Protein backbone atom coordinates (compact mmCIF):
# COMPACT_ATOMS: atom_id res chain seq x y z
CA UNK A 1 0.00 0.00 0.00
CA UNK A 2 1.24 3.14 -0.92
CA UNK A 3 0.99 6.21 1.39
CA UNK A 4 1.16 10.04 0.82
CA UNK A 5 1.62 13.26 1.85
CA UNK A 6 -0.38 15.57 0.24
CA UNK A 7 -2.53 15.35 -2.97
CA UNK A 8 0.35 16.88 -4.79
CA UNK A 9 2.74 13.38 -3.54
CA UNK A 10 -0.34 11.37 -4.41
CA UNK A 11 -0.34 12.42 -8.00
CA UNK A 12 3.12 12.31 -8.52
CA UNK A 13 3.22 8.64 -7.32
CA UNK A 14 0.42 7.68 -9.54
CA UNK A 15 2.07 9.53 -12.65
CA UNK A 16 5.27 7.95 -11.80
CA UNK A 17 3.95 4.43 -11.75
CA UNK A 18 2.83 4.32 -14.79
CA UNK A 19 6.51 3.06 -15.76
CA UNK A 20 8.00 2.73 -12.59
CA UNK A 21 8.32 0.42 -9.61
CA UNK A 22 6.56 1.02 -5.90
CA UNK A 23 9.98 1.55 -3.96
CA UNK A 24 11.84 4.10 -6.48
CA UNK A 25 8.68 5.97 -6.92
CA UNK A 26 7.20 6.57 -3.35
CA UNK A 27 11.38 7.52 -3.00
CA UNK A 28 11.10 10.23 -5.83
CA UNK A 29 7.68 11.00 -4.51
CA UNK A 30 8.19 11.29 -0.76
CA UNK A 31 5.68 8.68 -0.21
CA UNK A 32 6.10 5.71 2.63
CA UNK A 33 5.41 1.92 1.81
CA UNK A 34 3.42 -0.05 3.88
CA UNK A 35 2.10 -3.56 4.30
CA UNK A 36 -0.35 -2.45 6.68
CA UNK A 37 -3.90 -2.35 5.90
CA UNK A 38 -4.76 1.84 6.45
CA UNK A 39 -2.27 4.49 5.95
CA UNK A 40 -0.42 6.46 9.16
CA UNK A 41 -2.06 9.68 9.67
CA UNK A 42 0.65 11.87 8.06
CA UNK A 43 0.41 10.41 5.21
CA UNK A 44 -2.99 9.70 4.68
CA UNK A 45 -3.41 10.32 0.50
CA UNK B 1 15.87 20.59 -21.06
CA UNK B 2 14.47 19.99 -17.38
CA UNK B 3 13.98 22.82 -15.00
CA UNK B 4 12.55 21.61 -11.79
CA UNK B 5 11.16 24.42 -8.80
CA UNK B 6 13.83 22.92 -5.85
CA UNK B 7 16.26 20.12 -5.11
CA UNK B 8 13.31 17.70 -4.11
CA UNK B 9 11.62 17.78 -7.60
CA UNK B 10 15.23 17.55 -9.17
CA UNK B 11 15.44 14.26 -6.77
CA UNK B 12 11.86 13.33 -7.94
CA UNK B 13 12.57 13.70 -11.49
CA UNK B 14 15.90 11.80 -11.71
CA UNK B 15 14.20 8.63 -10.40
CA UNK B 16 11.19 8.84 -12.28
CA UNK B 17 13.33 9.03 -15.64
CA UNK B 18 14.99 5.56 -14.75
CA UNK B 19 12.01 4.41 -16.57
CA UNK B 20 9.80 6.91 -17.05
CA UNK B 21 9.60 9.69 -20.48
CA UNK B 22 10.41 13.33 -20.13
CA UNK B 23 6.78 14.70 -20.29
CA UNK B 24 5.26 12.35 -17.45
CA UNK B 25 8.27 12.77 -14.97
CA UNK B 26 7.85 16.48 -15.77
CA UNK B 27 4.36 16.35 -14.78
CA UNK B 28 5.00 14.05 -12.08
CA UNK B 29 7.86 16.11 -10.34
CA UNK B 30 6.27 19.79 -11.17
CA UNK B 31 9.39 20.64 -13.18
CA UNK B 32 9.27 22.40 -16.68
CA UNK B 33 10.57 20.92 -20.47
CA UNK B 34 12.14 23.60 -22.55
CA UNK B 35 14.23 23.22 -26.06
CA UNK B 36 16.00 26.42 -25.01
CA UNK B 37 19.62 25.90 -23.06
CA UNK B 38 18.40 28.09 -19.83
CA UNK B 39 16.11 27.76 -16.92
CA UNK B 40 13.64 30.30 -15.97
CA UNK B 41 14.83 31.52 -12.64
CA UNK B 42 11.65 30.22 -11.25
CA UNK B 43 12.67 26.54 -12.35
CA UNK B 44 16.11 27.09 -11.11
CA UNK B 45 17.08 23.29 -10.30
C1 LIG C 1 5.79 16.92 -6.58
C2 LIG C 1 5.52 16.73 -5.11
C3 LIG C 1 5.22 17.85 -4.33
C4 LIG C 1 5.06 17.70 -2.96
C5 LIG C 1 5.19 16.45 -2.38
S1 LIG C 1 4.89 16.28 -0.68
O1 LIG C 1 5.38 17.53 0.08
O2 LIG C 1 5.62 15.03 -0.16
O3 LIG C 1 3.48 16.11 -0.50
C6 LIG C 1 5.51 15.34 -3.13
C7 LIG C 1 5.65 15.48 -4.51
C1 LIG D 1 9.08 15.36 -3.60
C2 LIG D 1 8.90 16.77 -4.09
C3 LIG D 1 8.66 17.81 -3.19
C4 LIG D 1 8.41 19.08 -3.67
C5 LIG D 1 8.47 19.32 -5.04
S1 LIG D 1 8.23 20.93 -5.62
O1 LIG D 1 7.34 21.64 -4.75
O2 LIG D 1 7.67 20.93 -7.05
O3 LIG D 1 9.59 21.67 -5.64
C6 LIG D 1 8.72 18.31 -5.95
C7 LIG D 1 8.94 17.03 -5.46
Do not use: E, I
Not at 20 to 43: D, I, M
Request: hydrophobic content about 20%.
Amino acid sequence: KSCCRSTLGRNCYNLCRVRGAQKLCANACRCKLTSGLKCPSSFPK
